[PDB]
Paper text:
Previous studies have revealed that the juxtaposition of Asn or Gln with adenine is a generic mechanism for recognition of the adenine base. Based on the structural mechanism by which ZBTB10 recognizes the TTGGGG sequence, we rationally mutated Arg767 to either asparagine or glutamine and performed ITC assays to check their DNA-binding affinities. We found that the Arg767Asn mutant resulted in severely reduced affinities for both the TTAGGG and TTGGGG sequences. However, the Arg767Gln mutant (referred to as ZBTB10 ZF1–2R767Q) bound to the TTAGGG probe with an obviously higher binding affinity compared with the TTGGGG probe, indicating its preference for telomeric DNA binding. Next, we solved the structure of ZBTB10 ZF1–2R767Q in complex with the TTAGGG sequence. The G-strand sequence of the oligo is “TTAGGGTTATA,” and the C-strand sequence is “ATATAACCCTA”. We determined the structure in the P1 space group to 1.9 Å resolution, with one ZBTB10 ZF1–2R767Q protein binding one DNA duplex in each crystallographic asymmetric unit. We observed that the recognition pattern of G4G5G6T7T8 was preserved very well. Furthermore, Gln767 expectedly donates one hydrogen bond to the adenine N7 atom and accepts one hydrogen bond from the N6 atom of A3, thus conferring the preference of TTAGGG by the Arg767Gln mutant. Furthermore, the binding specificity is also proven by a cocrystal structure. These results raise the possibility that C2H2 finger proteins can employ the well-defined one finger-three base rule to specifically recognize the TTAGGG sequence, and there may be more C2H2 finger proteins functioning in telomeres.
Residue numbers in the entry: 720 to 772
Write the structure that this text describes.
DNA sequence: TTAGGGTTATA
DNA sequence: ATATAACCCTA
């Protein structure tokens, strides 16, 4: 099943949502806050976090 | 707030 | 079909 995660029982409705979900198992955090240096998994998370500054 | 589930739009 | 994006919801 191309919609099933190879690392857990999660099954996505769309292929793009499975690819996003894979990042929970790799731990990759490609986004950062320029003010405090904290790392984030999505760029929407940075915008959400920016409100503390 | 954090973080990952959901969704829809555009190319 | 993929790539990137954005916005909402919730524990
Ligand atoms: Zn998984
Ligand atoms: Zn910060």
């Amino acid at each position: 099943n191309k919609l099933k995660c190879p690392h857990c029982s999660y099954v996505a409705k769309y292929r793009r949502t499975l690819k996003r979900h894979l990042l929970i198992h790799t731990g990759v955090r490609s986004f950062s806050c320029d003010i405090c240096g904290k790392l984030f998994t999505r760029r929407e998370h940075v915008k959400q976090h920016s409100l503390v500054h």
